Design a protein around this ligand. Structure first.
Ligand SMILES: NCC(=O)NS(=O)(=O)OC[C@H]1O[C@@H](n2cnc3c(N)ncnc32)[C@H](O)[C@@H]1O
Ligand SMILES: NCC(=O)NS(=O)(=O)OC[C@H]1O[C@@H](n2cnc3c(N)ncnc32)[C@H](O)[C@@H]1O
Ligand SMILES: [Cl-]
Ligand SMILES: [Cl-]
Ligand code: NA
Ligand code: NA
Ligand SMILES: [Zn+2]
Lengths: 436, 398
């Protein structure tokens, strides 16, 4: 039994993900994120925004509409170029994306039809070509069309970036393994505008910087690699593209795309200047020169990053048992900043004298962190339940706590325990959790 | 010139909002949020999530797809009743036909209801308890509203609170009062908030009683508008999805050997509509010398601290940038060395920054800075190695 399936099964059982519309028949192309999944996803998003926007003078944020004017995607080239070769089996009429045999009926086909990957919708009463709009296949175009607006209000000057997170939509012909490839997914994209002659050096800077970002948040460097797009795989907007790939563990090739980092040269600002008639070039007053910035674009996938962090954090080891034995303990070794639950408050038993001190403590901690309270069953089994979802620290309230006003604090990975006065537990965890 | 127009112009000039696709012709039915706008919007969302989910034992979170199976909106009654049809269509898969027809969600609630049983299982929850969610919804609004008030694409913050039916009415009043207090706690003048009971004609097809929180936006004519809806949806939603799907979404109370379909109390807020309310409410003018100030609660202000070197100098600028870097570990910070310092104070007051930190020549001798509070303009001198802690207690959130 593989590790991807094991992790996917853990995620479903503990409510990281549910298949969207399960009760009506669900598919792998649409997932919901449950109580633990939504916190993990938001924590990843928050760390991306802190690294990209909050911590950097040279990067500012934006949030643009999923639905832009139709002309946007004409100018961008997506209307004409964002399609795949699509053929239909003359026997069953199932569709697939490229002699040859059918993977469902076994037979050896129609002429390849170009199928645009963008999702359509209609705005206004007339359901016609006039009101046709596309759901955005990328968040980048909302940034480019606001480049001049941001330069103005933010008083920014190249080299500088504009970062954004949001939903994107693609009419994927097939679903992926687990949450890897969905029709609706969240992206974290930053467009870094630079003076053209520096573009290549800035490209290497961001490849390295994004790579280090995953390592800093706990992914084993050995499970990350770089992949340079060959000229055929390059997107119509790119001159050079390097993907960060993670060892997901698929059957066959265990590697898959995690984040794409493209040199989009001056393509995007140029075509929007032409089609819109609005000048999106930059004027460098320090040299009395005008130029169209080149763009370096780190474009990450939030849900695909969640899958990578989840798989990388999965682990199994041997841990002291209730009896003097050892067990195959399941542990998600999340960075404390990503863990969906920061602290578990665990009264030794459901005894009525432990509950007052314990519930009061969980309330104090909920002021700062997402907290779980569990008084059900044996304590060691509740420790395993928290380790299984990656909780960094468990706080146990026992009967000695009523006499000395102190609790036990258990560290997830080492399982070491230390006794801490209650009036210092908040500070004790704050330094070890490194974020709220 | 009205306050809405004045506020909207400030929002545009300082980059809180831009009209989406401005360069290709934009309308008020779609807006982008600029550097300051996205921070304010995220701060409101985060404060909503903290009050609803993180701080409450009895409420957990979820995030569900914008595009659900078509059957969801048949069962919910939106296909048949949601017209004045207001739902946006899209087509999934190669065959572009009714076979692949799906609807973009007009509300986020249905993603919660269809997962009710899933959440009870994995989260081990029992009524009374809630499930909260933030995300984009879509409606084919016939006309746009004033500024960002009514758009075809907007963010909602909805929580579905499942209760034993006999307690539903008491829980309805609890959440009306609780939600009202949430806006007050974050700085909105209570006098600009009121309650409105839907008459039977205005009731939605899923609701038995609905109370709206309204804000005095300042529109021409009737200055009040809907801010947040709070509905008693009884057992309508879980009942209809159990029927159409054949999956039992009722709750079995082991403690009483009774099975029932919970009633639902739903506080459903609009993220973008709250931003408009917070933005207007905070706008103010005072002193002569007149001054424009956004009196944001420090937790919502998009920029927490501005670092302001008195002048350009090889000894002041490094100390100032080093300080701005230390503060960027915790908060969104602006660094501004352009122009006279009083001009830079006004620039920050105009977007609601709670605190300005000035680095002057005395800072080189005593390693201390001046900290100016936005509203009072009072100044206090603080050692550099205590500025972070000094600001942390006054910002009340990071
Ligand atoms: N702006 C430049 C760009 O778009 N670039 S990229 O087209 O390569 O998508 C950027 C990232 O979005 C993620 N991603 C893309 N498509 C999907 C999908 N269908 N499901 C899940 N994640 C996806 C993935 O992580 C990918 O690396
Ligand atoms: N689930 C129950 C429900 O949906 N109820 S409600 O339909 O009333 O929308 C809930 C909230 O979403 C916000 N909202 C609604 N429509 C819009 C719009 N077009 N633009 C901006 N905000 C809007 C607004 O704040 C409203 O109170
Ligand atoms: Cl975090
Ligand atoms: Cl209006
Ligand atoms: Na920044
Ligand atoms: Na909670
Ligand atoms: Zn076939």
């Amino acid at each position: 039994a593989s590790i991807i399936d094991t992790v996917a099964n853990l995620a479903k059982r503990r409510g990281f993900v549910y298949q969207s519309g399960e009760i009506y028949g669900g598919t792998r192309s649409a997932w919901d994120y449950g109580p633990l999944g939504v916190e993990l996803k938001e924590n990843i998003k928050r760390q991306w925004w802190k690294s990209m926007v909050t911590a950097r003078e040279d990067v500012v944020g934006i949030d643009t509409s999923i639905i832009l004017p139709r002309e946007v995607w004409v100018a961008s080239g997506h209307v004409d170029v964002f399609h795949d070769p699509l053929v239909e089996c003359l026997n069953c009429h199932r569709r697939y994306r490229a002699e040859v045999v059918c993977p469902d009926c076994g037979t050896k086909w129609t002429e390849p039809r170009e199928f645009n990957m963008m999702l359509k919708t209609y705005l206004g009463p007339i359901e016609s070509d006039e009101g046709l709009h596309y759901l955005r296949p990328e968040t980048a175009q909302g940034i480019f069309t606001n480049f001049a607006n941001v330069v103005t209000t933010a008083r920014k000057k190249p080299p500088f970036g504009i970062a954004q997170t949001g939903k994107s939509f693609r009419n994927e012909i097939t679903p992926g393994n687990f949450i890897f490839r969905t029709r609706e997914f969240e992206q974290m994209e930053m467009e870094f505008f630079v003076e053209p002659s520096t573009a290549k050096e800035w490209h290497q800077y961001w490849i390295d910087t994004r790579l280090q970002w995953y390592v800093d948040l706990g992914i084993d460097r050995d499970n990350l690699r770089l992949y340079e797009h060959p000229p055929e795989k390059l997107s119509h907007y790119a001159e050079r593209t390097v993907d960060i790939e993670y060892k997901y563990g698929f059957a066959g090739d265990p590697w898959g795309e995690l984040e794409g980092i493209a040199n989009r040269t001056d393509f995007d600002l140029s075509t929007h200047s032409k089609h819109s008639g609005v000048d999106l070039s930059y004027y460098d007053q320090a040299t009395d020169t005008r130029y169209v910035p080149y763009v370096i674009e780190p474009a990450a996938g939030l849900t695909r990053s969640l899958m990578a962090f989840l798989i990388d954090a999965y682990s199994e080891d041997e841990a002291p048992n209730a009896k003097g034995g050892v067990d195959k303990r399941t542990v998600l070794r999340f960075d404390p900043r990503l863990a969906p639950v920061k602290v578990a408050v665990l009264p030794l038993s459901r005894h009525a004298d432990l509950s007052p001190k314990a519930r009061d403590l969980a309330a104090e901690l909920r002021q700062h962190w997402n907290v779980e309270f569990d008084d059900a069953g044996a304590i060691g089994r509740r420790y395993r339940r928290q380790d299984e979802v990656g909780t960094p620290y468990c706080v146990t309230v026992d009967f000695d706590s009523l006499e000395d006003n102190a609790v036990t604090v258990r560290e997830r990975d080492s399982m070491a325990q230390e006794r801490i006065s209650i009036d210092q537990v908040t500070d004790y965890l704050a330094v070890r959790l490194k974020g709220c």
